Design an enzyme around this catalytic site. Structure first.
Site, PDB file in Angstrom:
ATOM      1  N   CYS A  65       0.626  -0.635  44.694  1.00 44.61           N
ATOM      2  CA  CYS A  65      -0.108   0.434  44.011  1.00 44.61           C
ATOM      3  C   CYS A  65       0.469   0.834  42.655  1.00 44.61           C
ATOM      4  O   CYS A  65       1.594   1.303  42.570  1.00 44.61           O
ATOM      5  CB  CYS A  65      -0.190   1.704  44.875  1.00 44.61           C
ATOM      6  SG  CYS A  65      -1.186   2.999  44.064  1.00 44.61           S
ATOM      7  N   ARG A  68       0.960   5.143  41.612  1.00 41.61           N
ATOM      8  CA  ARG A  68       1.875   5.966  42.404  1.00 41.61           C
ATOM      9  C   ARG A  68       2.562   7.150  41.704  1.00 41.61           C
ATOM     10  O   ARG A  68       3.192   7.932  42.371  1.00 41.61           O
ATOM     11  CB  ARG A  68       2.955   5.077  43.028  1.00 41.61           C
ATOM     12  CG  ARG A  68       2.464   4.300  44.247  1.00 41.61           C
ATOM     13  CD  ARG A  68       3.573   3.453  44.820  1.00 41.61           C
ATOM     14  NE  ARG A  68       3.787   2.216  44.067  1.00 41.61           N
ATOM     15  CZ  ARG A  68       4.888   1.491  44.165  1.00 41.61           C
ATOM     16  NH1 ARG A  68       5.886   1.901  44.955  1.00 41.61           N
ATOM     17  NH2 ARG A  68       5.009   0.357  43.470  1.00 41.61           N
ATOM     18  N   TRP A 237      -8.785   7.445  42.200  1.00 36.84           N
ATOM     19  CA  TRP A 237      -9.874   7.101  41.311  1.00 36.84           C
ATOM     20  C   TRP A 237      -9.700   5.630  40.953  1.00 36.84           C
ATOM     21  O   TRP A 237      -8.648   5.053  41.190  1.00 36.84           O
ATOM     22  CB  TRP A 237      -9.868   7.962  40.058  1.00 36.84           C
ATOM     23  CG  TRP A 237      -8.494   8.070  39.402  1.00 36.84           C
ATOM     24  CD1 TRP A 237      -7.887   7.145  38.603  1.00 36.84           C
ATOM     25  CD2 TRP A 237      -7.575   9.172  39.518  1.00 36.84           C
ATOM     26  NE1 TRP A 237      -6.640   7.618  38.184  1.00 36.84           N
ATOM     27  CE2 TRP A 237      -6.427   8.846  38.747  1.00 36.84           C
ATOM     28  CE3 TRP A 237      -7.614  10.402  40.197  1.00 36.84           C
ATOM     29  CZ2 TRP A 237      -5.321   9.699  38.653  1.00 36.84           C
ATOM     30  CZ3 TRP A 237      -6.514  11.259  40.092  1.00 36.84           C
ATOM     31  CH2 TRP A 237      -5.388  10.902  39.312  1.00 36.84           C
ATOM     32  N   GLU A 242     -10.619  -2.943  38.328  1.00 36.36           N
ATOM     33  CA  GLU A 242     -11.050  -3.237  39.703  1.00 36.36           C
ATOM     34  C   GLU A 242     -12.540  -3.511  39.748  1.00 36.36           C
ATOM     35  O   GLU A 242     -13.023  -4.338  40.531  1.00 36.36           O
ATOM     36  CB  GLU A 242     -10.747  -2.061  40.622  1.00 36.36           C
ATOM     37  CG  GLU A 242      -9.263  -1.890  40.899  1.00 36.36           C
ATOM     38  CD  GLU A 242      -9.013  -0.643  41.723  1.00 36.36           C
ATOM     39  OE1 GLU A 242      -8.939   0.469  41.125  1.00 36.36           O
ATOM     40  OE2 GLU A 242      -8.907  -0.782  42.970  1.00 36.36           O
TER      41      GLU A 242
HETATM   42  C1  HEM Z   1      -4.990   8.026  42.022  1.00 33.89           C
HETATM   43  C2  HEM Z   1      -5.520   6.880  41.563  1.00 33.89           C
HETATM   44  C3  HEM Z   1      -5.086   5.549  42.069  1.00 33.89           C
HETATM   45  C4  HEM Z   1      -5.139   4.418  41.337  1.00 33.89           C
HETATM   46  C5  HEM Z   1      -5.650   4.351  39.917  1.00 33.89           C
HETATM   47  C6  HEM Z   1      -4.656   3.357  42.142  1.00 33.89           C
HETATM   48  C7  HEM Z   1      -4.613   2.022  41.709  1.00 33.89           C
HETATM   49  C8  HEM Z   1      -4.503   0.967  42.615  1.00 33.89           C
HETATM   50  C9  HEM Z   1      -4.910  -0.381  42.377  1.00 33.89           C
HETATM   51  C10 HEM Z   1      -5.585  -0.902  41.125  1.00 33.89           C
HETATM   52  C11 HEM Z   1      -4.610  -1.115  43.482  1.00 33.89           C
HETATM   53  C12 HEM Z   1      -4.872  -2.593  43.689  1.00 33.89           C
HETATM   54  C13 HEM Z   1      -6.192  -2.740  44.458  1.00 33.89           C
HETATM   55  C14 HEM Z   1      -6.656  -4.177  44.570  1.00 33.89           C
HETATM   56  O1  HEM Z   1      -6.359  -5.027  43.682  1.00 33.89           O
HETATM   57  O2  HEM Z   1      -7.341  -4.521  45.570  1.00 33.89           O
HETATM   58  C15 HEM Z   1      -3.994  -0.232  44.401  1.00 33.89           C
HETATM   59  C16 HEM Z   1      -3.510  -0.670  45.610  1.00 33.89           C
HETATM   60  C17 HEM Z   1      -3.128   0.272  46.551  1.00 33.89           C
HETATM   61  N1  HEM Z   1      -3.129   1.630  46.444  1.00 33.89           N
HETATM   62 FE1  HEM Z   1      -3.463   2.712  44.914  1.00 33.89          FE
HETATM   63  N2  HEM Z   1      -4.320   3.823  43.348  1.00 33.89           N
HETATM   64  C18 HEM Z   1      -4.521   5.153  43.379  1.00 33.89           C
HETATM   65  C19 HEM Z   1      -4.367   6.046  44.448  1.00 33.89           C
HETATM   66  C20 HEM Z   1      -3.939   5.682  45.727  1.00 33.89           C
HETATM   67  C21 HEM Z   1      -3.848   6.524  46.848  1.00 33.89           C
HETATM   68  C22 HEM Z   1      -4.260   7.972  46.873  1.00 33.89           C
HETATM   69  C23 HEM Z   1      -3.300   5.798  47.890  1.00 33.89           C
HETATM   70  C24 HEM Z   1      -3.021   6.311  49.251  1.00 33.89           C
HETATM   71  C25 HEM Z   1      -2.589   7.569  49.513  1.00 33.89           C
HETATM   72  C26 HEM Z   1      -3.080   4.473  47.393  1.00 33.89           C
HETATM   73  C27 HEM Z   1      -2.532   3.406  48.090  1.00 33.89           C
HETATM   74  C28 HEM Z   1      -2.694   2.079  47.647  1.00 33.89           C
HETATM   75  C29 HEM Z   1      -2.426   0.952  48.563  1.00 33.89           C
HETATM   76  C30 HEM Z   1      -1.958   1.023  50.006  1.00 33.89           C
HETATM   77  C31 HEM Z   1      -2.699  -0.173  47.884  1.00 33.89           C
HETATM   78  C32 HEM Z   1      -2.586  -1.610  48.386  1.00 33.89           C
HETATM   79  C33 HEM Z   1      -3.700  -2.017  49.362  1.00 33.89           C
HETATM   80  C34 HEM Z   1      -3.592  -3.485  49.750  1.00 33.89           C
HETATM   81  O3  HEM Z   1      -2.537  -4.001  50.171  1.00 33.89           O
HETATM   82  O4  HEM Z   1      -4.597  -4.202  49.664  1.00 33.89           O
HETATM   83  N3  HEM Z   1      -3.470   4.461  46.072  1.00 33.89           N
HETATM   84  N4  HEM Z   1      -3.918   1.059  43.862  1.00 33.89           N
HETATM   85  C1  LIG Z   2     -10.446  -7.011  51.455  1.00 30.67           C
HETATM   86  N1  LIG Z   2      -9.921  -6.443  52.712  1.00 30.67           N
HETATM   87  C2  LIG Z   2     -10.235  -7.384  53.801  1.00 30.67           C
HETATM   88  C3  LIG Z   2      -8.456  -6.203  52.667  1.00 30.67           C
HETATM   89  C4  LIG Z   2      -8.100  -4.956  51.875  1.00 30.67           C
HETATM   90  C5  LIG Z   2      -7.882  -3.717  52.496  1.00 30.67           C
HETATM   91  C6  LIG Z   2      -7.551  -2.595  51.724  1.00 30.67           C
HETATM   92  C7  LIG Z   2      -7.448  -2.711  50.331  1.00 30.67           C
HETATM   93  O1  LIG Z   2      -7.135  -1.645  49.523  1.00 30.67           O
HETATM   94  C8  LIG Z   2      -7.193  -1.812  48.102  1.00 30.67           C
HETATM   95  C9  LIG Z   2      -7.013  -0.460  47.483  1.00 30.67           C
HETATM   96  C10 LIG Z   2      -6.333   0.524  48.180  1.00 30.67           C
HETATM   97  C11 LIG Z   2      -6.190   1.781  47.620  1.00 30.67           C
HETATM   98  C12 LIG Z   2      -6.717   2.028  46.365  1.00 30.67           C
HETATM   99  C13 LIG Z   2      -6.577   3.289  45.797  1.00 30.67           C
HETATM  100  C14 LIG Z   2      -7.122   3.503  44.532  1.00 30.67           C
HETATM  101  C15 LIG Z   2      -7.782   2.473  43.855  1.00 30.67           C
HETATM  102  N2  LIG Z   2      -8.291   2.702  42.614  1.00 30.67           N
HETATM  103  N3  LIG Z   2      -7.903   1.254  44.426  1.00 30.67           N
HETATM  104  C16 LIG Z   2      -7.388   1.023  45.662  1.00 30.67           C
HETATM  105  C17 LIG Z   2      -7.542  -0.211  46.228  1.00 30.67           C
HETATM  106  C18 LIG Z   2      -7.670  -3.945  49.721  1.00 30.67           C
HETATM  107  C19 LIG Z   2      -7.983  -5.054  50.494  1.00 30.67           C
HETATM  108 CL   LIG Z   3     -13.281  -1.659  45.087  1.00 33.45          CL
END
Ligand code: HEM
Ligand SMILES: CN(C)Cc1ccc(OCc2ccc3ccc(N)nc3c2)cc1
Ligand SMILES: [Cl-]
Ligand code: HEM
Ligand SMILES: CN(C)Cc1ccc(OCc2ccc3ccc(N)nc3c2)cc1
Ligand SMILES: C[C@H](O)[C@H](O)[C@H]1CNc2nc(N)[nH]c(=O)c2N1
Ligand SMILES: C[C@H](O)[C@H](O)[C@H]1CNc2nc(N)[nH]c(=O)c2N1
Ligand SMILES: [Cl-]
Lengths: 362, 362
Positions: A65, A68, A237, A242
């Protein structure tokens, strides 16, 4: 060893959590209480403070993420009290409304009752609370290919989409005791959508592209001190890439680059013209423009990487080790223009954290 | 254990090499010869065939290289016979001429005598045979910051650059026995340079950008069957992003994005305008255009990734494990538009291979 793993995770979590909360002296008695509660019941119950801080720590520890910096302002909604499918539905509806906040998006998580002995109390089937359906019949692709299997599972259950490119999937989830999930159509008044236009290319609206305002990820498990909250949807947001570089551009998603190239007036014929790159930039510009014009929160990848640098600096100042997944943190366009590209990150897994879990369908 | 490590590396290399050359029956006697040669002399000498195939295998095993489809057509020049600094100089001059090939670049490596007992016979100081000098005095940056320390080492030795942004560094190398390296100015007739223009933005030439035609990496060690060829410069042709997204764009290199933005008529004021991304695309387009217009070989990153997919397929068909470094293989612009981004690679190190080695200066 069931109670063992739990007890150990509890000690590590409580100690760390209470230290950050300035409550280190209460650790002893709290661990005592917890010890007994596990012995007698097989589990323990987080206080409101532990749960809220645990959810925030879990975001702070999410290696992939880039968002963060804002971990400490996560809005945590405690819904461990829900017992019925109408309550779950209404909690999900409320999450959407409160996270959306008329476009000024609030990062929010709603936490449902945790697994008992591996038994789920609530099992959410959606990948995100708001997402578009996807279909294929007779080699015709409609909508979002990433939703194809969930869409087929919904239609098996009596849902039917209109087969536009942007049908909203119903909320779908299953309660402990029930053999089948239930589904509920999303009220349209709850869902903000943004039509995609370009700041200076008028023909861009001919593409009739749109996207939804808020990504609410609903299929990850929150783990906190040995307790498994398998149902705990959360949102931030969007970062513009994305939508513009992945959802609308990937060949296995909406696959829009050739159409973008045509409306911006360039040929899509030669790799050396870099027409895909140029199309990607114009689509990503249109996406940021459109969200900003509508008053829906969004961040561009440069601003996001600058925020992440501050998160790195804050981690150092706090004596906390930083963890990250370089392959996910780099943005999918102009990654070498961000500081992220030019350094390395330790990809170690620290708990509390959010985890993938098995799909209940397919 | 000196002779031990060598002997083991020799057995593994000879076996693999001769198998690929269809010569498996000659392995036994060749290993016998080698065994004796090591016992008596401390080392062994590669045949012309082993050396050529070893250099090709080393390229095939270079995890970070997207250009590997063409591994088998590497032009290998055997210069294990050089004994004098004039011979080394003339071999380096010849390499430049033959690799350049009037702009139709031939991937080539020239191999100098290997280390004896860790003792270098020839020690090349240049990072690339053709590269621009870099200076800083009074907070004024001139030329290429990446060359700042080599440039200062050259000027310590009596070389003096004209302090343009594009001064060619002298060739600089040291012979076994000599305390100091020697330097030789590059004859200009040997060096192709490309002025950077844009296909449809006429003002782009106001930037007065140029780059050299051929990247000839001269500071890596080739290792083949336990033998360490520390001096073995090699080249391919450029991928356009190396020049446009890194050499000319990185803030710690020529740092040209703000100037590009100005000549293409966009503001460089707001992150949400994606002006860096747009500038990067136009610079990368200009770079491909300019090399093609001049008749100098170059590949765009899309075409390069398509070639690499074929390399992957060829590896599978040949029963060879593929190794790669995802973080290096992805291009620094539009990486998600290539298949590379969407899969993973085993980053294991297989020999023969090319390796970093310590700088002799700084
Ligand atoms: C506040 C604005 C936020 C932005 C701009 C942001 C941005 C991102 C982006 C761009 C990704 C990559 C997603 C992808 O390529 O599929 C990501 C992954 C992630 N974000 Fe954030 N995020 C935010 C908030 C949060 C929040 C609130 C949480 C949880 C409390 C969170 C937890 C995660 C997690 C767990 C992943 C990885 C998911 C995975 O393994 O596929 N994010 N974030
Ligand atoms: C594609 N699925 C089968 C697996 C998968 C599950 C959760 C995933 O979360 C991505 C993710 C998680 C949290 C986010 C928070 C904010 C944001 N802008 N994008 C965010 C994007 C991504 C892939
Ligand atoms: Cl999405
Ligand atoms: C024929 C055209 C070639 C192309 C287009 C090509 C492309 C590339 C690119 C773009 C890189 C990354 C460079 C960087 O980011 O700093 C690279 C790395 C590399 N290439 Fe190639 N290459 C080619 C030929 C060769 C040849 C002939 C060799 C040696 C025989 C070679 C060996 C390597 C090695 C060792 C690296 C990694 C160096 C490091 O670790 O820093 N390549 N290649
Ligand atoms: C920056 N130096 C201190 C470390 C360093 C040494 C060799 C390096 O080689 C990069 C490299 C190697 C071979 C190449 C072949 C073709 C090509 N187009 N680029 C190529 C680029 C890179 C970095
Ligand atoms: C296999 C490959 O490394 C993988 O699909 C990754 C690469 N990096 C990524 N980074 C982000 N942010 N999101 C992704 O979906 C991916 N995909
Ligand atoms: C530390 C960081 O991962 C590193 O600087 C890498 C990233 N990937 C790269 N990839 C390529 N091709 N070239 C590079 O110089 C780098 N830099
Ligand atoms: Cl270079």
């Amino acid at each position: 060893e069931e109670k063992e793993i739990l007890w150990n995770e509890a000690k590590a979590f409580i100690a760390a959590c209470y230290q950050e909360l300035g409550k280190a002296a209460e650790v002893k008695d709290r661990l005592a209480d917890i010890k007994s509660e596990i012995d007698l019941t097989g589990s323990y119950v987080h206080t409101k403070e532990e749960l809220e801080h645990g959810a925030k720590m879990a975001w702070r520890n999410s290696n992939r993420c880039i968002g963060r910096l804002f971990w400490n302002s996560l809005n945590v909604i405690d819904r461990r009290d829900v017992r019925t499918k109408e309550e779950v539905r209404d909690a999900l509806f409320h999450h959407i409304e409160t996270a959306t906040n008329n476009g000024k998006i609030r990062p929010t998580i709603t936490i449902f009752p945790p697994e008992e002995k591996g038994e789920k109390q609530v099992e959410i089937w959606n990948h995100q609370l708001i997402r578009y359906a996807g279909y294929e019949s007779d080699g015709e692709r409609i909508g979002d290919p990433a939703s194809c299997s969930l869409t087929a599972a919904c239609e098996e259950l009596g849902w039917r989409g209109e087969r536009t490119d942007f049908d909203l999937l119903p909320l779908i989830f299953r309660m402990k005791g029930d053999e089948q999930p239930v589904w509920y159509e999303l009220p349209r008044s709850l869902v903000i959508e943004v039509p995609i236009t370009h700041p200076d290319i008028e023909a861009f609206s001919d593409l009739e592209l749109k996207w939804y305002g808020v990504p609410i990820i609903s299929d990850m498990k929150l783990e906190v001190g040995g307790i498994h909250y398998n149902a705990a949807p959360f949102n931030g947001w969007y970062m513009g890439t994305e939508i513009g570089a992945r959802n609308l551009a990937d060949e296995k998603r909406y696959d829009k680059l050739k159409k973008v190239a045509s409306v911006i007036g360039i040929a899509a014929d030669y790799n050396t013209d870099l027409w895909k790159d140029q199309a990607l930039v114009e689509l990503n510009k249109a996406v940021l423009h459109s969200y900003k014009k509508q008053g829906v929160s969004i961040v561009d990848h440069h601003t996001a990487a600058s925020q992440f640098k501050r998160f790195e600096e804050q981690a150092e100042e706090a004596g906390r080790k930083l963890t990250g997944d370089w392959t996910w943190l780099i943005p999918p366009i102009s990654p070498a223009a961000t500081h992220i590209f030019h350094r390395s990150y330790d990809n170690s897994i620290v708990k509390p954290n959010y985890f993938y879990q098995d799909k209940p369908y397919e």
